[PDB]
Amino acid sequence: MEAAHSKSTEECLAYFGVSETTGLTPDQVKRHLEKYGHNELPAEEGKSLWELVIEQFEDLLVRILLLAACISFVLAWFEEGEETITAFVEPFVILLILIANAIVGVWQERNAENAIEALKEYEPEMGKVYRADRKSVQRIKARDIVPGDIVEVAVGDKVPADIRILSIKSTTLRVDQSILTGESVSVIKHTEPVPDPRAVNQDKKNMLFSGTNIAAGKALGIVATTGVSTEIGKIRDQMAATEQDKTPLQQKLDEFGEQLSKVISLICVAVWLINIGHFNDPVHGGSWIRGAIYYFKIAVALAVAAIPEGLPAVITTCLALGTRRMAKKNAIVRSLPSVETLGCTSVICSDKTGTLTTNQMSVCKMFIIDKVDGDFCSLNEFSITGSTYAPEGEVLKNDKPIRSGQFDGLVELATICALCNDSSLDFNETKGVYEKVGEATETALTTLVEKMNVFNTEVRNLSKVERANACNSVIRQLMKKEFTLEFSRDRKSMSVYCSPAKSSRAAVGNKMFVKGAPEGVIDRCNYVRVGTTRVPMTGPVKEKILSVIKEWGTGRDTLRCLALATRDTPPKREEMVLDDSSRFMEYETDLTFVGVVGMLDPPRKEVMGSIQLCRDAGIRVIMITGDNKGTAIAICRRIGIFGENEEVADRAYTGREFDDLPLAEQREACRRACCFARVEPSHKSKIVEYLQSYDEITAMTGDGVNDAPALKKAEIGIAMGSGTAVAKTASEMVLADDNFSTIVAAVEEGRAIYNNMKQFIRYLISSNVGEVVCIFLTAALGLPEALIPVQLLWVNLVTDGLPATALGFNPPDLDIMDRPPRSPKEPLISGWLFFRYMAIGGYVGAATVGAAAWWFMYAEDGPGVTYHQLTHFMQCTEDHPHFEGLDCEIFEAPEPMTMALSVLVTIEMCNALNSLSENQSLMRMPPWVNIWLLGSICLSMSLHFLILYVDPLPMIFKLKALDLTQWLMVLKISLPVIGLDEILKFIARNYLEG
Ligand SMILES: CC(=O)C1=C(O)N2[C@H](C1=O)[C@H]1c3c[nH]c4cccc(c34)C[C@H]1C2(C)C
Ligand SMILES: [K+]
Numbered sequence: 002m003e004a005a006h007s008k009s010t011e012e013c014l015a016y017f018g019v020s021e022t023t024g025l026t027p028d029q030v031k032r033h034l035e036k037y038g039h040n041e042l043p044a045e046e047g048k049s050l051w052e053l054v055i056e057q058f059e060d061l062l063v064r065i066l067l068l069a070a071c072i073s074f075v076l077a078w079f080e081e082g083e084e085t086i087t088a089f090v091e092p093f094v095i096l097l098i099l100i101a102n103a104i105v106g107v108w109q110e111r112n113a114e115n116a117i118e119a120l121k122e123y124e125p126e127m128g129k130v131y132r133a134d135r136k137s138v139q140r141i142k143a144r145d146i147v148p149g150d151i152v153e154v155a156v157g158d159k160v161p162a163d164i165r166i167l168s169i170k171s172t173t174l175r176v177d178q179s180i181l182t183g184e185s186v187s188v189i190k191h192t193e194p195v196p197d198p199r200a201v202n203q204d205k206k207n208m209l210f211s212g213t214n215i216a217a218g219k220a221l222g223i224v225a226t227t228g229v230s231t232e233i234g235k236i237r238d239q240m241a242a243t244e245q246d247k248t249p250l251q252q253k254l255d256e257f258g259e260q261l262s263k264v265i266s267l268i269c270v271a272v273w274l275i276n277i278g279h280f281n282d283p284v285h286g287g288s289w290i291r292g293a294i295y296y297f298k299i300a301v302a303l304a305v306a307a308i309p310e311g312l313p314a315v316i317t318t319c320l321a322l323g324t325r326r327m328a329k330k331n332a333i334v335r336s337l338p339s340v341e342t343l344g345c346t347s348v349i350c351s352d353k354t355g356t357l358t359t360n361q362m363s364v365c366k367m368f369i370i371d372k373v374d375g376d377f378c379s380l381n382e383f384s385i386t387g388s389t390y391a392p393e394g395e396v397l398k399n400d401k402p403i404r405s406g407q408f409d410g411l412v413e414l415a416t417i418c419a420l421c422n423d424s425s426l427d428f429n430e431t432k433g434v435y436e437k438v439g440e441a442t443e444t445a446l447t448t449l450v451e452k453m454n455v456f457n458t459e460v461r462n463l464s465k466v467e468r469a470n471a472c473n474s475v476i477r478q479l480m481k482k483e484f485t486l487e488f489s490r491d492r493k494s495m496s497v498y499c500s501p502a503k504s505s506r507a508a509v510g511n512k513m514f515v516k517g518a519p520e521g522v523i524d525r526c527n528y529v530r531v532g533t534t535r536v537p538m539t540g541p542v543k544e545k546i547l548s549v550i551k552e553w554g555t556g557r558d559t560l561r562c563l564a565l566a567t568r569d570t571p572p573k574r575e576e577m578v579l580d581d582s583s584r585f586m587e588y589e590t591d592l593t594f595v596g597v598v599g600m601l602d603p604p605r606k607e608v609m610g611s612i613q614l615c616r617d618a619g620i621r622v623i624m625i626t627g628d629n630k631g632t633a634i635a636i637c638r639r640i641g642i643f644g645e646n647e648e649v650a651d652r653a654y655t656g657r658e659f660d661d662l663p664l665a666e667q668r669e670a671c672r673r674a675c676c677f678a679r680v681e682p683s684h685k686s687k688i689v690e691y692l693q694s695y696d697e698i699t700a701m702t703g704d705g706v707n708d709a710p711a712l713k714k715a716e717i718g719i720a721m722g723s724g725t726a727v728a729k730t731a732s733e734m735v736l737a738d739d740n741f742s743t744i745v746a747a748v749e750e751g752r753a754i755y756n757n758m759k760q761f762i763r764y765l766i767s768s769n770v771g772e773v774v775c776i777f778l779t780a781a782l783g784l785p786e787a788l789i790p791v792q793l794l795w796v797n798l799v800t801d802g803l804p805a806t807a808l809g810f811n812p813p814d815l816d817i818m819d820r821p822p823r824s825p826k827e828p829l830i831s832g833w834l835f836f837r838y839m840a841i842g843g844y845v846g847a848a849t850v851g852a853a854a855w856w857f858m859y860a861e862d863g864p865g866v867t868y869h870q871l872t873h874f875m876q877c878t879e880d881h882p883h884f885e886g887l888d889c890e891i892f893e894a895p896e897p898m899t900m901a902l903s904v905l906v907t908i909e910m911c912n913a914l915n916s917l918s919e920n921q922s923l924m925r926m927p928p929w930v931n932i933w934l935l936g937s938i939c940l941s942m943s944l945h946f947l948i949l950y951v952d953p954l955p956m957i958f959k960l961k962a963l964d965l966t967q968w969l970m971v972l973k974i975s976l977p978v979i980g981l982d983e984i985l986k987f988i989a990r991n992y993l994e995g
């Protein structure tokens with residue numbers, strides 16, 4: 002039964018064929034359980050199983066190093082060196098780092114919770130059912146419950162399934178639908194049917210929802226739906242049938258991984274083709290096994306060269322250092338990649354109450370009737386001071402303080418505000434200020450009564466606690482509050498039956514004090530109270546009322562107006578059916594209009610600037626409020642979403658309005674919409690869908706299970722610090738202070754992070770491109786090896802890793818919030834950016850080879866050799882006369898490899914200084930600004946010397962320390978990389994920018 006609310010209690014029993022007294026026979030239970038299934042949610046299958054790390058080794062860019070480790074393992078054994086511990090190092094360190102980054106990569110255990118698993122906390126353990134096989138109440142497993150079961154609920158019980166209420170045993174039934182609404186006020190239930198077949202859950206007053214808990218009372222009902230067919234269950238499937246795409250940056254890294262793998266395979270073929278000259282060599286002039294070693298070692302050389310082994314470790318550290326900054330600005334970020342895509346936020350859909358507004362309801366203005374004479378109709382408007390729940394304020398007419406008690410209309414005005422009120426005030430001594438008890442709207446009314454004091458009660462002689470509900474209680478002394486007709490959206494009003502206390506206070510029998518929305522209440526007023534007398538509600542009178550109400554709501558005041566009326570001659574106590582929530586509007590007819598109060602929902606202090614900030618940032622802000630379209634628009638103008646005098650007749654839609662538009666016009670509306678009022682529960686996810694259809698990264702906000710699918714669907718789901726648990730588990734970010742400013746503040750941080758992130762990524766790539774050119778030149782030409790793969794590991798992981806991490810602390814480029822959002826499918830490196838790091842990579846490939854070539858030819862300690870014979874070092878043992886000077890071991894000396902290594906490091910330190918900005922020169926951007934960079938550079942050279950002095954290190958790295966004679970040449974070939982890159986920067990700012 003999906004429409005149990007629309008059916009009567011008799012029809013719902015007849016449907017399942019079950020007696021309300023007996024219940025379901027065990028024969029029916031077997032049939033229903035086999036048909037509808039168990040009352041439970043499906044389990045999740047993908048926990049911390051051995052599958053964990055394995056999937057890291059599925060993409061091509063990591064299986065190459067796993068393959069290169071196999072090749073390295075072959076070459077680590079096949080050697081004529083009696084060396085011991087330094088044998089298995091090249092395949093060991095590769096494998097160790099391979100596992101290390103895999104463990105870092107498989108970090109979804111601590112930095113990624115579950116939202117659907119959290120939704121299994123609502124489904125209770127056991128529930129009370131009345132089966133036919135037993136007389137007494139028997140509690141069974143909640144999952145054993147089937148549709149049609151005659152279940153029982155009491156105070157404290159957690160509702161097991163969606164249940165159509167049959168009979169209420171207690172006086173009144175209240176349930177805590179906090180998870181399915183976000184609110185807190187326990188709603189009242191009834192048994193009479195909700196005629197509307199497509200009514201929302203808030204209107205289903207005869208239904209208990211699975212996951213809800215009864216706040217007060219005890220009732221009996223029949224199960225409508227179980228499992229996934231419940232309201233919670235249906236929301237689960239919406240989140241279950243929603244795939245979450247990985248952030249665009251990660252796709253670029255995966256795309257870069259595929260392209261890089263093509264380059265690596267290309268060179269290995271290229272090297273194979275350069276070595277085609279060995280096809281014309283005598284078989285009796287060597288061994289093919291000596292060639293295979295060369296082919297295999299160059300293969301693993303290119304692998305460790307082209308690939309940034311440190312990058313996954315650096316970004317994971319960088320993002321973690323971002324989250325701590327997000328938390329300092331009241332922005333708890335759940336997942337790590339979220340801090341990157343957060344900068345690419347283009348649209349922020351925020352709720353009004355709580356985020357955009359401080360939620361400080363305070364009655365500012367109120368009016369009553371002064372004089373009615375046919376066409377003439379004057380009002381008595383009053384203003385109230387004090388935007389707080391504290392009774393520290395005063396009422397003034399025409400900017401002059403007046404006694405509210407001297408006006409008869411104001412007395413009945415304060416009377417209704419006091420009696421027709423379920424909220425109150427309570428003074429807090431720990432904090433030192435007053436606090437609200439119940440709803441914020443009604444508490445503001447309680448505060449108003451205290452400020453007015455229509456009976457002039459002593460206040461200065463009272464304490465701070467007695468001050469809270471002082472005047473309000475005095476009103477409760479006059480009238481005895483019989484019963485309260487609960488609020489409902491069908492009539493948008495609330496009344497309360499009051500009987501006069503035994504003291505003969507001149508009361509015409511009983512009275513009904515009505516409080517509700519102006520539209521409905523005013524139309525149900527046949528009479529108008531003018532002080533004490535009563536006049537019939539005429540046309541001209543209603544014109545004045547609605548006009549002022551319109552002025553207070555549409556005006557710059559942006560007030561929430563509440564019409565207050567009273568029923569002078571109410572129906573008898575016996576004639577009223579209290580269980581009928583549909584006859585409540587009928588009982589609230591023939592009313593007499595008293596007055597209208599106008600309270601304020603004040604904007605945050607910082608949202609004014611934050612809104613303006615998003616204007617310059619190119620971030621579209623969309624407000625979602627519960628106000629009427631008119632006031633919704635006015636608040637938009639007030640906070641800066643709209644101009645004070647600009648046209649927005651198409652940029653704001655009500656829920657009703659947006660629903661009457663066809664699917665095409667709905668999508669067309671979501672690109673220009675900035676204000677949504679009276680939004681239906683499903684519209685928030687619809688808006689996200691439409692926004693994502695324009696490739697627009699959306700930051701939707703919410704704080705309930707209703708908002709859970711929307712938060713799951715949006716790129717940046719935003720929950721509140723006070724929001725429900727499930728909303729937080731479905732969000733990517735949780736605002737600690739529930740502010741809209743901390744959304745904007747987080748986005749600015751995320752944009753600065755992404756800029757510094759892209760900078761060191763290109764920095765590491767620049768080194769890797771160079772190690773390709775270096776190995777390619779030293780292999781194609783036939784030169785002796787310049788760089789060992791065991792060295793390249795410690796170069797990219799440490800020597801380049803530390804300054805790259807320090808590039809994350811690069812100062813945020815000012816005027817960054819004056820640029821549009823970073824495009825999703827924006828290439829990391831393309832065009833000039835490719836050629837820029839192509840030239841740097843090419844130069845350092847020649848600088849390293851040239852360094853080793855310098856020591857081999859034009860050197861001090863190096864032998865006097867020429868280039869044409871250096872390329873033929875593999876013939877030192879064969880061609881003896883052409884190669885003569887010393888041992889053949891001098892071609893495999895540690896000095897020239899130390900040259901290429903020291904030069905590569907020295908350049909990368911200069912390249913890190915070049916990565917202080919993308920285009921700003923080193924003359925414009927001082928190389929001493931980023932202190933963390935200089936501190937990292939000094940640590941790099943300190944470790945570079947540590948592996949050349951402490952004997953257990955240079956033997957493993959196959960290096961030999963240089964003196965001042967050799968270090969001079971290192972700087973002469975390294976430092977010119979600064980000038981070359983400086984030229985490129987100047988070209989980019991002169992013949993490219995425009
Ligand atoms: C074994 C494993 O967990 C991993 C790592 O060990 N790595 C990275 C990585 O994810 C590899 C990777 C995939 N996509 C890219 C883009 C840019 C750089 C890298 C990667 C580094 C790759 C490797 C093998 C170092
Ligand atoms: K999401």
Ligand SMILES: [Mg+2]
Nearest residue numbers: 057102103106
């Ligand atoms: Mg990985």
